[PDB]
Design an enzyme around this catalytic site. Structure first.
Site, short mmCIF file in Angstrom:
data_model
loop_
_atom_site.label_atom_id
_atom_site.label_comp_id
_atom_site.label_asym_id
_atom_site.label_seq_id
_atom_site.Cartn_x
_atom_site.Cartn_y
_atom_site.Cartn_z
N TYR A 364 0.57 6.57 -6.13
CA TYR A 364 -0.36 6.55 -5.31
C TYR A 364 -1.84 6.39 -6.31
O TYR A 364 -1.56 6.38 -7.67
CB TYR A 364 -0.79 7.64 -4.53
CG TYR A 364 0.00 7.69 -3.30
CD1 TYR A 364 1.51 7.83 -3.09
CD2 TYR A 364 -0.49 7.50 -1.87
CE1 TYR A 364 2.13 7.73 -2.11
CE2 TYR A 364 0.22 7.55 -0.65
CZ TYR A 364 1.57 7.65 -1.06
OH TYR A 364 2.30 7.89 0.30
N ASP A 378 11.95 7.64 -4.90
CA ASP A 378 12.70 8.20 -4.11
C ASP A 378 14.44 8.18 -3.93
O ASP A 378 15.00 9.38 -4.02
CB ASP A 378 12.64 7.24 -2.70
CG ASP A 378 11.35 7.17 -2.21
OD1 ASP A 378 10.50 8.53 -1.79
OD2 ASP A 378 10.40 6.44 -2.18
N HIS A 519 -1.55 2.76 -2.11
CA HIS A 519 -0.51 2.89 -2.89
C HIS A 519 0.46 1.79 -2.95
O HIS A 519 -0.01 0.91 -2.61
CB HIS A 519 0.38 4.11 -2.46
CG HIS A 519 0.81 3.81 -0.90
ND1 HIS A 519 0.05 3.94 0.17
CD2 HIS A 519 2.02 3.40 -0.56
CE1 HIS A 519 0.69 3.54 1.26
NE2 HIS A 519 1.91 3.08 0.78
CU LIG Z 1 3.24 2.14 2.03
#
Ligand SMILES: [Cu+2]
Ligand SMILES: [Cu+2]
Ligand code: NA
Ligand code: NA
Ligand code: NA
Ligand code: NA
Lengths: 720, 718
Positions: A364, A378, A519
């Site tokens: 971000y 992730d 982001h």
């Molecule tokens: Cu997005």
């Protein structure tokens, strides 16, 4: 012993259609397409008759079947989609028995402790040459099946290897300075710690929240800021962002802004509470599940394959037209596509030894206290395979799909079967080619693509990956992002309010008091390609305009600059979609004397703006730690322990142990085994159209045969 | 009584028999019919139908009443097509109006005996009256008019006719314009080649024993300020030649380095150019399957057994929240008009008119047979006219509806194009999904409505898809397939002496065959009226900026936003990392943001992308066709500005398209804009594309940007 047809078939997951005029049931599940008439003593499965001892019975507009009907019909063998494996393929994931076995072996060491969790338990890959010899020559692999067992002892990581054939422990190695990934119990543990905190409850109370029990927490990794975040490097920490649960089923729409708790997982308590100005919680109900909506009528659309599929799935091997490949599951990166060959008129040619997601990052751009550290890795930090989202049949994939279950280990070492984990489906994709010569009969054929689809959800985001096998030899890899945006609570209701400008410096105002913070989504794929063998070279072809020196009226021509990229360092580069990058085999040519190649296209398009690099100054730490963010193409020498673009233990890492590391020594890429890494991302600037739920956005990459074949690959078998 | 299978298949319907169920399933376009032998009724799109005469089985074949097709298919129970009681004012000229327009100009004393017609099209009413018809049902109060563009030998005349009062309103010679290529030019050229001894003489030298097996292909010659030796008044075409060896693919047999220049008014060759002799590549390279056998494959069907979600009322299409009008033009093909999105009951404007603007396929090889080679497929050849009928099930999915379309041919005789355009709905993945941990899943399916058109000009075949997403996005995709234009060369493999020279300008794709490098550059003309016609062009450039707010970050992600105020500035390269909006500064969504559409001229492609024109800026083609070198253009709406390459680009000497339209650099501030998107590929060939090219695609996109106030597919509130 009869049972109700409709309910029983629903629970089994079959589609049930009744046709009153034809008095005919049509039943669909996966590879099976079934017709049955009430009181008939045969049914039809994939075009083939099946005797039923007990016919479907109709009683007062209600159908009943025996309690063996489902087994008798669906499991009959007239559905030929799945066949059983003669000899186990050396790349088959660990089975449940193998998982349980690996957990007993490490538990038999005096070092194991009841607090010990398992970040990953995975087949330790046999060696590549032997796996290929099995696939192409059918040579058995005589090294014993092994498992990697990566353990988290409190906050410490130990890597253990076990030998499954001999039920023995082979090694037990503490890994200095590594942090482990976030595990499922950390989530519960964070919610609990917050719930027992009088300070946190007081913090929450001055921010308007009257029932602290309605507070939903979520855990994020903290990253690494060389101490500026004021957080010691060696402790297991997570930060915690909070939301108010308002009963609309969307807590994500009610951020409690400027309140961040830092949690120490070993001490099980809050070691720091950062607080900024008070911003009233956005309260309006913003359900995304339809509860407040009308469902209009849609007419049905079905994609049917009434004689079965064109692919066969034998164990985990998938065969389809000229393709063959092996498909397995890993708790970290999800699906792994291995030993990919293309059958060229009888000879299986190598294309790809192993392809998978490498890793991904979602960083971000807002510097405030709730945001500045925010960067989801992730797969690496949260385990995307583990978080696989079962396919919603007919929606998340088309009605003609087959849905596979996959088994992985959970964090306490227990086998876990994920239902509907991967979808496999053939699809029409327009004309393969066409030519309508004026005055002649047309020539057109259809294009078919075989898709493998996997969806993983991490907190508010949902990611879809498609591995797309074109009949003509092309391979597509597309990533889709949907889910719920991470939003920032702000004071402005419209852009006319006085804080609007300041509130929207780092993102768009997508609802009252709600900003979709800007982001990026940066995916990276690790593709170990063996283009008709392992010994490959990287070749550039740059189309260029050159002055005409041949005479005639043109001042310029279109020419190509062709050069080898001879080392890892030069191979690490931006991708200009105007240029051609090949992985060629310098030892094998097509019929015209051209080296057989695949063209690598890390950027073949996307539906959001494209990320040209990392949107970070070069002196940010996250920039330093994650070099894969900034180049779209990398190539490295094959190496079985180099699998992650972000590095094997990225939680609170201080330097780049991923693609930066794998290429630091700048080794030779001349005629040798190479691994290609494609980075592609989006820069996501939000809009109201994406709230409260975001429409799926897609990016596309491509691998195309380039002089791998001698002619149009889909022309057909030569009749003379 | 008549036999079912024969009758149904002559009607165009698919017949399936299911012996287990004793059921026929009959499918054509929007009709999905089920019928049992002996039954007194049938089902059409889910609804019951009484039959006068049951289907009867005789000797295991089915027989139907002579009235069956009409009774069943035209029963009214297929609701795909509805009657239009009040004709939309952009409806294309009908066959009767084409004939009427031709009679009117033929009645004038100025009409010369063998005059041809380059184009006969609706001269439409004014934009404002057309929107008021569509949005408020106000009758346009203008008579039906037609533009009639005539070619008298080599002379262009533009006439205008009033079809209601059946009178000629104007007749205007157009000085210096050359006409596009007409169908009879192809045969004329081949006849002239055939009757030339000099040519048979040239051909013979080049190794060709029967000159009757030589196949010509006509190309426009371009403009080179005399350096080509070619006179500017003469109606000219150059002629490239191939040998027919019986493989159905003359394209695979070039006669390299032999160009003839034909003057079509003299009907003769006026210049032969001859370069080194290269043996004609001879090996048979059929692409039609005569030498192949396809592998057997299981059936796939995409079925909609209650019919379609779209309704087609005349040419007006309604589908979900979309409404638009679809008509056919002989030059550019399909035109998609008066497009609106129904926002919870209120029709809001999106696009007044969109179509192909024009395209070009320019080559990069300087030799004698290549240097001038640049196909302007629509402008010079007429892509609507060369529409290729959709091959049902293949060129489009089995659930499509195939429309017929009518235009005028070059003699002014109406011409009905069968299966000219396909319309079909398709599954396109999940529209959105969220699987909250430990909660019930939320997923809905994406549906797209595609309008598909294919045109074929010589060796290539182009596919265009206009794609309406339920969520407000519009995609426009362009596909290329067909046969490569190849250069005959000496080399067999890259190990032969000439290989390097032979491949300077293209890949060696077969023995003696080089696929010369070129580009495909498509341009789309989109008169967007974003929730009204008064719009402005806004840039948003995501940038990295230093952090001024405190904490450990050195940098932040921000946007630079600024208006683009005039035409010259709007004519730009597209960086796909930036955002470009056509915003309505007068209307805002619920959060105070100007309602906008985001314009994406490059959303991807399967072939390499052109950054612009692969020509030095002093090339003539570069000067004539500015549109090739920028990906976005925005100009002030003007009724006679339609073609990026200009109205009469055959041997144009300057830029009468987008260069001319942006020439005065007018203001784009809060006014009626027209957006033009140029997207292109650079094609370096490979053996995989020979003898026939696997379809390659480019994508473009128009996305609502703060046009709505939320996810547009959530549905209406309870
Ligand atoms: Cu997005
Ligand atoms: Cu091309
Ligand atoms: Na290396
Ligand atoms: Na490799
Ligand atoms: Na203008
Ligand atoms: Na406009």
């Amino acid at each position: 012993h009869m049972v109700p047809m409709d309910k029983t078939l629903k629970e089994f997951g079959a589609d049930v259609q009744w046709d009153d005029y034809a008095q005919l049931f049509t039943l669909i599940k996966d590879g099976a397409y079934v017709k049955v008439k009430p009181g008939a003593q045969t049914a039809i499965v994939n075009g083939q008759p099946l005797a039923l001892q007990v016919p479907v019975v109709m009683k007062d507009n209600k159908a009943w079947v025996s309690d063996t009907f489902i087994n008798d019909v669906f499991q009959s063998g007239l559905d030929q989609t799945f066949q059983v494996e003669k000899r186990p393929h050396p790349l088959n994931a660990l089975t449940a028995d193998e998982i349980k076995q690996a957990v007993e072996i490490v538990k038999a060491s005096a070092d194991f402790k009841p607090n010990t969790r398992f970040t990953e338990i995975s087949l330790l890959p046999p060696d590549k040459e032997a796996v290929w010899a099995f696939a192409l020559e059918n040579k058995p692999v005589d090294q014993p099946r092994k498992a990697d067992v990566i353990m988290l002892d409190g906050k410490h990581i130990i890597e253990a290897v076990v030998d499954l054939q001999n039920n023995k422990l082979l090694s037990w190695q503490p890994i200095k300075d590594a942090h482990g990934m976030v595990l499922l119990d950390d989530f519960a543990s964070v919610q609990n710690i917050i719930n027992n905190s009088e300070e946190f409850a007081a913090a929450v109370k001055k921010r308007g929240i009257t029932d602290a029990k309605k507070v939903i927490t979520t855990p994020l990794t903290v990253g690494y800021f060389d101490g500026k975040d004021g957080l010691k490097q060696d402790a297991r920490l997570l930060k915690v962002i909070s939301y108010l649960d308002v009963g609309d089923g969307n807590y994500w729409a009610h951020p409690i802004e400027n309140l961040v708790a830092v949690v120490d997982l070993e001490q099980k308590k809050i070691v720091k509470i950062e607080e900024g100005p008070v911003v009233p919680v956005p309260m309006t109900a913003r359900p995304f599940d339809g509860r407040d909506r009308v469902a209009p009528a849609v007419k049905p659309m079905q994609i049917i394959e009434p004689e079965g599929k064109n692919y066969t799935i034998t164990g985990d091997m998938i065969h389809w037209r000229n393709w063959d490949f092996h498909l397995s599951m890993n708790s970290r990166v999800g699906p792994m596509i291995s030993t990919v060959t293309y059958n060229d008129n009888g000879t299986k040619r190598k294309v790809m030894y192993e392809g998978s997601l490498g890793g991904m990052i979602v960083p971000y751009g807002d510097p405030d206290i709730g945001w500045y550290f925010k960067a989801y890795l992730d797969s690496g930090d949260y385990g995307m395979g583990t978080l696989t989202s079962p396919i919603a049949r007919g929606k998340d994939a088309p009605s003609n799909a087959v849905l596979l279950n996959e088994t992985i280990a959970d964090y306490t070492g227990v086998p876990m079967e994920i239902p509907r984990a991967i979808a496999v489906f053939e699809r029409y994709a327009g004309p393969e080619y066409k030519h309508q010569e004026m005055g002649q009969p047309n020539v057109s054929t259809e294009r078919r693509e075989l898709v493998v689809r996997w969806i993983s959800t991490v907190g508010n985001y949902d990611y879809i990956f498609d591995w797309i096998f074109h009949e003509n030899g092309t391979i597509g890899i597309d990533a889709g992002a949907t889910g719920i945006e991470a939003v920032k609570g702000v004071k402005a209701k419209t852009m006319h309010d006085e804080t609007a400008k300041d509130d929207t410096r780092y993102g768009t105002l997508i609802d009252h008091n709600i900003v979709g913070t800007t982001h990026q989504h940066i995916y990276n794929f690790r593709l170990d390609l063996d283009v008709d063998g392992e010994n490959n070279s990287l070749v550039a072809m740059d189309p260029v305009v050159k002055p005409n020196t041949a005479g005639g009226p043109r001042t310029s021509t279109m020419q190509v600059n062709q050069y080898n990229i001879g080392n890892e360092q030069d191979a690490a580069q931006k991708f200009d979609p105007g240029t051609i990058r090949l992985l060629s085999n310098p030892n094998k040519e097509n019929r015209m004397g051209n080296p057989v190649s695949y063209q690598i296209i890390p950027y073949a398009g996307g539906t959001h703006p494209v990320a040209k690099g990392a949107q970070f100054a070069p002196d940010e730490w996250i920039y330093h730690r994650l070099s894969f963010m900034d180049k779209q193409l990398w190539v490295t020498r094959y190496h079985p322990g180099e699998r992650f673009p972000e590095g094997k233990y990225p939680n609170r890492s201080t330097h780049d142990t991923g693609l930066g590391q794998y290429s630091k020594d700048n080794e030779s890429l001349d005629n040798t085994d190479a691994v290609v890494w494609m980075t592609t991302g989006t820069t996501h600037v939000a809009r109201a159209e994406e709230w409260p739920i975001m429409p799926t956005e897609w990016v596309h990459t491509l691998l195309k045969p380039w002089n791998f074949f001698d002619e149009t690959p889909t022309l057909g078998a030569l009749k003379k």
